[PDB]
Amino acid sequence: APRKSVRWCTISPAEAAKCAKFQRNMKKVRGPSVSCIRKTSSFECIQAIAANKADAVTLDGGLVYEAGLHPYKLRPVAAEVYQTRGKPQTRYYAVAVVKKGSGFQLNQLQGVKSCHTGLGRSAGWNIPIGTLRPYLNWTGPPEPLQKAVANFFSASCVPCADGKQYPNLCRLCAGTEADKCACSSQEPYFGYSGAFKCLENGAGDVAFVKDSTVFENLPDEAERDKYELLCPDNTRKPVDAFKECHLARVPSHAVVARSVDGREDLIWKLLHRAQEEFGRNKSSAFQLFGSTPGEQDLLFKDSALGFVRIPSQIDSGLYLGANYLTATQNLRETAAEVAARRERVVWCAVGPEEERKCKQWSDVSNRKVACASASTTEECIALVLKGEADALNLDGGFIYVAGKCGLVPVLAENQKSQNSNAPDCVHRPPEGYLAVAVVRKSDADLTWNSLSGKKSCHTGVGRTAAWNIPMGLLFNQTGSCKFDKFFSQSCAPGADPQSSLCALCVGNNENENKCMPNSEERYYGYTGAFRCLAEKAGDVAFVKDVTVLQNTDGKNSEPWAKDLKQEDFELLCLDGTRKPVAEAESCHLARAPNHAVVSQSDRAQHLKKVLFLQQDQFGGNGPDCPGKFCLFKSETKNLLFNDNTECLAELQGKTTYEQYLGSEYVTSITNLRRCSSSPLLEACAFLRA
Structure with missing residues (x-):
């Protein structure tokens, strides 16, 4: 009966001495004992985990994208909840640390030394290079992004870097022979605390690290004051300014097992008692976070407060909150692919029923629109969150969900109601x-x-x-x-x-x-x-x-x-x-309230335009609808929109649903969550913390 105790994968002799050290106290309090085993790197550890010679490990947002990547599809077990210096979150911000005096504004970065947290990590890689993209001058993926970086930076310290291929990127990574830039803390300037040192040490000119890493590594505001930050406003700003001067604010790391037969509970079992009786002045005898300064940042992140069990439908992309997975997927495309996407609106059609309508529409749109539908509206919504999709006319109540998730009303399902008609529908008071x-x-x-x-x-x-x-x-x-x-x-x-x-x-x-x-x-x-x-x-x-x-x-x-x-x-x-x-x-x-096309605000505004043009390419208003296609015209089935829908119109400033739907309904529709609710609303309630 003894449920198989878990097996955490460690990527270094210290990650092991560490699991070892933890091991001691587990049978010592007699909680769910573990058994760790080694695999050199985060990516290497993933394999053991899925092909189960191991089971679960903790990894950075970036790696999750990978962890959940088809080749191996793994599930985001539990993300690290960090201190917020406000209210404890998972989503860390992204900035690049810079020596005041080096003064090379972000853009003005061409050819200097670059310290990295590793190949593929969040702020440590996926994030930076991506914004440094435009400048890079890279045709696309067929030519590995990998070479444009060195070709961009005179030097770089990128753990897990394919060194023999183009030397230049391990140039900045000190090390053993082997371990020089070997993806593990067997390399200093690695992770946050590691890469950070890089800088201070001379060869390190700039790095992009956890919106804390300095703070992490500096208990002297005078030595802290020793620094400045690189911002998208291209200019430099203060350290703690990571709130108003920074790149991307990605969700933390997480523990992850196989998306399949996770043991998830067994897992959470561990994390719980672990978070209960060690660290946080819980075990003056032992602790898992504040660890070594000699091999900084370990298994998780030191001082990474606690964590939270990610409820269950979340898969790679899902946990990644659209925006960032966008950035990451985009990291492997051509401006062509890219460009196209950004205007060729993805629509989710509630079922095969609507799926074909859009198909039809996908065809007349002159390839302007394109869709992948999903089972029930929920999944559709979700999908947009996943980012594969962009929009759908949602029903009020339905939209509710969107908002709780962060979706904003773009155009409303205007009644085509009669009263004093004209194209004024385009922007007419919603008759609800x-x-x-x-x-x-x-x-x-x-x-x-x-x-x-x-x-x-x-x-x-x-x-x-x-x-x-x-x-x-x-x-x-x-x-x-x-x-x-x-x-x-x-x-x-x-x-x-x-x-x-x-x-x-x-x-x-x-x-x-x-x-x-x-x-x-x-x-x-x-x-x-x-x-x-x-x-x-x-x-x-x-x-x-x-x-x-x-x-x-x-x-x-x-x-x-x-x-x-x-x-x-x-x-x-x-x-x-x-x-x-x-x-x-x-x-x-x-x-x-009627319905309305809702969207990831950051896509939405651009949609608004395309719809405005597109709708007049059809609509129970324009001429071609009578002809070869009708959007807000169904066949009484009322797919996407209602056949009685004049034009999707402008909201009245009602950007948040709390606005659009409005207090009373808004509030009451949650009273109802009380009795019973959906895993999806749960998920939102859990991610958009």
């Missing part, structure tokens, strides 16, 4: 929308309070229309965090398949794949949940009045209901009542 509980006409008595334990129709969970608004009320009036027993059983897209509220749900034409978030479920969208009441099955549905009209007296043509008179249904008023379809501007549930 009116969700309403349209009840089936005939059945009159089934009024408000009375709903008690019925069959119900939903556009989805976590969505405006039907979910959010309705659900909240009920619970407000029933505390049913275990909702079900209010609505005997319904059909809503996304709940527990084996939910006691899905059932009603039907799969594709071939009746398979029921109770899920995507239109390829005859009941998903404002649309299908209408199909639900009409299918005389679910005895009550809420959504916006608009959807009704969308599919009444011929407004729509699918055989199933093309027939139903708009007079076939009543609309359930709050005050007991059940008003007419049309007249819900009294009767409705309430008015809520």
Whole structure:
């Protein structure tokens, strides 16, 4: 039964004496004992870890990208949480340390000495070179970026550098014969604390190190004052100024096991007791961080406060918070590839259902647009976060998620509503929308309070229309965090398949794949949940009045209901009542925010333009939509946008969702997280700390 004690991979005789030293105290307090084994470098250790002659090790943001790289796909076990000199974070900033007097402003860097933390590490490599890119004069990857660096710097100390290939980069790395620049602390100017020394020592002219490394290495503000910083403003700034003068602020390092059969718990087991009874004035007898100055920075980072178990769907890219993985992937492309990307907008189409629409669109866009869809909106969103994708028109409630993750509204799903029309849609006041509980006409008595334990129709969970608004009320009036027993059983897209509220749900034409978030479920969208009441099955549905009209007296043509008179249904008023379809501007549930294309702010603004142009290349406004393509026009299916959507328009300054959606809804939609929530919102709650 003894779960196999873990095996940490060490890249040096010290990383081992260290695991050894730790080992002692493990059986000494008798917690989850380990067994470390050696593999020369971080990359070398990764292999043992995955091909399990080992299991887990700690590595820098950069290396994760690698750790999670296809050849070996490993999972970000637990990142180091560092002191923040504010509130303890994982995301470290990136700056380059410079000797005041050397004065060579970033740009003015051509051909001096460069000290590095290693080949491939965050601020130690991936980050610097990338910004030093433009200047470098490198065709692209076919010509290894590797040579442009030396060709750029008269000298460099880059651990794990392919020295015999072009000498120049190990030129600055002191060392044994072997160990000179051998990727491990068997080389001084390595990692943070190592590379740092490099500088002070003369041969070291500039390095880019942890926004602390100096502080790490300097307990004398007079000796600290001995330094200055290199900033993207090209000018130099103070040390502690790493907050306002620096390159990229990447997420820390982390422990990582195989994305497969991690032992993750076993792992966390260790880290926990370790963080419980050593370091932090916990074990005056032993500690794991404050370690040696002779072989500085070890297994993790010295003084790296604590850590956090990364919850589970996170994979390489995911943990890497788009922006940085962008930088890294970009490190292996051509301005061609690059350029192209930056304007050829990636879109995620909620399912194969939308996947083809975009495909179509990918074709008429004159290759301006291109997509990879994802299962459910969540995954789509997530995807954008992963960075493979760029956008999707999100539903209010859905957008909520985006924001909590850091996504900002770009253009809103404008109603095409009538009033005093003109291209002014482009920027028109959002008429929001009116969700309403349209009840089936005939059945009159089934009024408000009375709903008690019925069959119900939903556009989805976590969505405006039907979910959010309705659900909240009920619970407000029933505390049913275990909702079900209010609505005997319904059909809503996304709940527990084996939910006691899905059932009603039907799969594709071939009746398979029921109770899920995507239109390829005859009941998903404002649309299908209408199909639900009409299918005389679910005895009550809420959504916006608009959807009704969308599919009444011929407004729509699918055989199933093309027939139903708009007079076939009543609309359930709050005050007991059940008003007419049309007249819900009294009767409705309430008015809520429309949808809107949301994005990673840093891509978004550029999108805004392309959409503005693109939409007029289609739209229930322009001329070509009538012709060879319609965006905000579906086929009533309402993919990406609604066929009734005039143009995606300008927000009213409402950049954050907290803005767009707004306090009340904003707040209430979290009350709901209470009862149950998604791993994704969890993940966001966890990364965007």
